[PDB]
Nucleic acid binder design. Structure first.
Ligand SMILES: [Ca+2]
Ligand SMILES: [Ca+2]
Ligand SMILES: [Ca+2]
Ligand SMILES: [Ca+2]
Lengths: 95, 95
DNA sequence: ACCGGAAGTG
DNA sequence: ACTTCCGGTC
DNA sequence: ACCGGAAGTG
DNA sequence: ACTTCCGGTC
């Protein structure tokens, strides 16, 4: 079953979702255009009725410690997957 | 009559006030230890019944544009008078 | 907490 | 020369 | 808006 | 592997 970061990649890959979540075109950077719609869909995925962006974003922040994501500083709702050796290892072989 | 920055200097000079506002000892840096007490006293000074730190701090921020103050980044309630040529001119000859 | 736009006041 | 309000961002 | 501590859950 | 809550800071 899908971890949050994997679920986001499935959303980002499909043009059907571009109105609420999209790759920006710079490396692996992405924007949660409608972050509450991303949250609603993650909530459905996990059977979490009350999921919202506040709580979703906290898991994104935990990904900073895991080394697979970073915030794009000063860009609203914009994050990026990290392009570095530790990030690829963690994403290639998720536990 | 006293401008905000002058009134603060009068407070900072007197040891009687050290519990709510004090020079930190680094150049002209100072801390509003109890910022609402600073606000209450500024309010009395200006006959502004409802003065608070939110509104007082906005005038401090206007002083950034005037060039006589700066925030000390990341230090709670800590500001400094600027030590540079424009600041001294503005403080020596206030309009 | 902090930032700055916007509109206001003898 | 601020005051008030307030939307936006570590 | 964003940050991270703290305590929680099949 | 997050979820929930929430105090703190541009
Ligand atoms: Ca921005
Ligand atoms: Ca490593
Ligand atoms: Ca601090
Ligand atoms: Ca000059």
């Amino acid at each position: 079953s899908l971890q949050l970061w994997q679920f986001l990649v499935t959303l980002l890959d499909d043009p059907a979702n571009a109105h609420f979540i999209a790759w920006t075109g710079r490396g692996m950077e992405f924007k949660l255009i409608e972050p509450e719609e991303v949250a609603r869909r993650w909530g459905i995925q996990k059977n979490r009725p009350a999921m919202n962006y506040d709580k979703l974003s906290r898991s994104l922040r935990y990904y900073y410690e895991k080394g697979i994501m970073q915030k794009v500083a000063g860009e609203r709702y914009v994050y990026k997957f990290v392009c570095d050796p530790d990030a690829l290892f963690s994403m290639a072989f998720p536990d």
